[PDB]
Design a binder for this molecule. Sequence first.
Ligand SMILES: Cc1cc2nc3c(=O)[nH]c(=O)nc-3n(C[C@H](O)[C@H](O)[C@H](O)COP(=O)(O)OP(=O)(O)OC[C@H]3O[C@@H](n4cnc5c(N)ncnc54)[C@H](O)[C@@H]3O)c2cc1C
Ligand SMILES: NC(=O)c1ccc[n+]([C@@H]2O[C@H](COP(=O)([O-])OP(=O)(O)OC[C@H]3O[C@@H](n4cnc5c(N)ncnc54)[C@H](O)[C@@H]3O)[C@@H](O)[C@H]2O)c1
Length: 401
Amino acid sequence: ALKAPVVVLGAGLASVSFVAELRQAGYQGLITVVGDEAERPYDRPPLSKDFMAHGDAEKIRLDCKRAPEVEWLLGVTAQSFDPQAHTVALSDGRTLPYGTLVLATGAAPRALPTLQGATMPVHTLRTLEDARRIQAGLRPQSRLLIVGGGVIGLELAATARTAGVHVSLVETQPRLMSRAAPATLADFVARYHAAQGVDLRFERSVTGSVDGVVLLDDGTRIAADMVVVGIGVLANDALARAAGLACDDGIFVDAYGRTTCPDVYALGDVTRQRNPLSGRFERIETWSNAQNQGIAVARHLVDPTAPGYAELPWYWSDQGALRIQVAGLASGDEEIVRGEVSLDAPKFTLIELQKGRIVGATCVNNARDFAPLRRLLAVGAKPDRAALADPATDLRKLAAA
Ligand SMILES: Cc1cc2nc3c(=O)[nH]c(=O)nc-3n(C[C@H](O)[C@H](O)[C@H](O)COP(=O)(O)OP(=O)(O)OC[C@H]3O[C@@H](n4cnc5c(N)ncnc54)[C@H](O)[C@@H]3O)c2cc1C
Ligand SMILES: NC(=O)c1ccc[n+]([C@@H]2O[C@H](COP(=O)([O-])OP(=O)(O)OC[C@H]3O[C@@H](n4cnc5c(N)ncnc54)[C@H](O)[C@@H]3O)[C@@H](O)[C@H]2O)c1
């Protein structure tokens, strides 16, 4: 069960949500949190959004009030832990004893080889320090080159374009958001950005850089005042790999957050868990998972009677005039399109069914519909289809079932 003292490695959203719940759930023993970043815990979503505008870090901190009597060692790096001795080695020479150790060390932005040394600025966007460096070089008319058509990339493009900056983007795949988005949505998102002035380069990839210019695998090149790489992340599982835990670019855990090493748990971006919708193990790297999974695992540690994590995946993405929300899977048997798909009236909903069962949904500028659809997906609803394609009230249909 829950052996004290509790030691959490990492101080991001997963860590803060987990420790807050431990307390709320009634745990009153010792709790210590080790954060390598010398920063008061903050949320990352704003780093590519509003923060890029106001640059106010006090407007994006996380609320640790729900987590009383917790000692946060910020600026300190957990160098390793001994699972037999039940201790953690810190970078300041200290050692922390633990009864129950949690690894919520998240992940880190994948680096871009070829751009090794490329004279001009080259950043990744993961931290507040990153956010700050990039924000600086976002001077108007300047030229920004984004490598990666993922969510960080398109969110920065919108913010870069929204500030008089010029934007160019390179993607290796034939479409954007290849990772977790319906193709229907990607074609549109691509259409939207191109329309906002973004130079999209598909099936292209950066091969190098020679004096403030970038080389592409298409024999061509592109000039840029600053390059921001957004090509995915890698789990910060180095410590678990060394302590012999089971992992492969992410730590494997069950619905209780258990790793293959006794008394050691893991949550957040740093883990590969089961997707209840695809029945496959994968790394769910979303804000909702970071928070929801932390609480779930904390809730069960304090009370074994409580169920394991079961929340279904979903996430949002703010890209300029596009308020996107994607839940469940990106495809299935068929997809129903509620509303019209136009660059002028950007407002619509996509529903992904598998053999009649809703397995995913996408809401563009339509938050009213998201909540009910998540409810219907939550129960694998098998609603009409015709009533599902025409102006019916989902809140209601959801209410019916
Ligand atoms: C710019 C940006 C925008 C985003 N926007 C969205 C969005 O719109 N919607 C959405 O759903 N999600 C979004 N996300 C994703 C969301 O931020 C992540 O899902 C969430 O932060 C994952 O939390 P985490 O607790 O697992 O780990 P993280 O936040 O990575 O934190 C782990 C922490 O542990 C530290 N650490 C690692 N190793 C050690 C060690 N050995 N010792 C001590 N400390 C260590 C790390 O440095 C880090 O500070 C965004 C992310 C970024 C970066
Ligand atoms: N709105 C959101 O949900 C959101 C926003 C920002 C960041 N995040 C989180 O940030 C982390 C990483 O985000 P991300 O956007 O960098 O990654 P990602 O995996 O979402 O997207 C990376 C994109 O880069 C492309 N790519 C890969 N290698 C490339 C190369 N060499 N050149 C050009 N393109 C290449 C991929 O095909 C993919 O479309 C994840 O944990 C993610 O969930 C989420």
